Symmetry: C3
Subunit: 114 residues, 3 copies
């Protein structure tokens, strides 16, 4: 799985340990081993949410399966909770796009996961 | 909706007011309230279009509905017009990927839009 | 085609000529005319792969057609090979999301490709 967060929160406000925490929590939520989880945080962005520039985040989660109605609600609670606790971003200023990838459409290690 | 533009134009060349303009114009175009429009501009990027480093942009528009053949043509005229007028990017050096998202695949506010 | 690479490799480790090499090799691999190939490299990122901050890359290739099981395996060998040779990134620390775009969902030059 791959999780990306783009945010206007400044780099110095991203706490130590954040990428590991994301990795761990996503391994647990998706059921996939942590060795397969990739995470990416992009602070200091020029962004607005609903016409204002208070802290916000635009995110994506791509996974080979483990995407669906109930699962996505659970991921959103988890991820908004982490962004609120750690980055002080209000959950109503977070969007997360979920993408169920086919294995043949994910490249890795000179081939695909097919 | 979420609109992202990645460009090699320098940050100083992005007008004050640009995020607000995008917000307002996208609210009008999509028919969605401005409160739900998110915009993100990323200048100073290392990119090429057709092998050239002249000004260019790579963009995306994700929306729950309001995506289709005629709508996307209209969005493209609007958004290339704004990039031309405000960032001085030729329309033939812009790509915009349009994505019709299912509500169950968009997280927001500790849940999804489903 | 649009190819994006996000990496924790520093900017100074991205060799001169890399965008041009990507453009050329993607035009050949995809069959597409070089004029339609866009490339974007984003160094210095805060990212982890498998919990580890060793060099890694998170990438995407969007194309109107030319996406499929065998094609994507071929792209992955090409692109992981270039990332290994030029950026010193292990192929097993690269993910590439492949996306087959509908022509009606790609904006360019004030319109779409449909």
């Amino acid at each position: 799985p791959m999780f990306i967060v783009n945010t206007n929160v400044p780099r110095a406000s991203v706490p130590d340990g954040f990428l590991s925490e994301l990795t761990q929590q996503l391994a647990q939520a998706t059921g996939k081993p942590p060795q397969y989880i990739a995470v990416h945080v992009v602070p200091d962005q020029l962004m607005a949410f609903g016409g204002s520039s208070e802290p916000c985040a635009l995110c994506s989660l791509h996974s080979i399966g483990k995407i669906g109605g109930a699962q996505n609600r659970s991921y959103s609670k988890l991820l908004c909770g982490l962004l609120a606790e750690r980055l002080r971003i209000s959950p109503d200023r977070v969007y997360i796009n979920y993408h169920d990838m086919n294995a043949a459409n994910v490249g890795w290690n000179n081939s695909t996961f097919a």
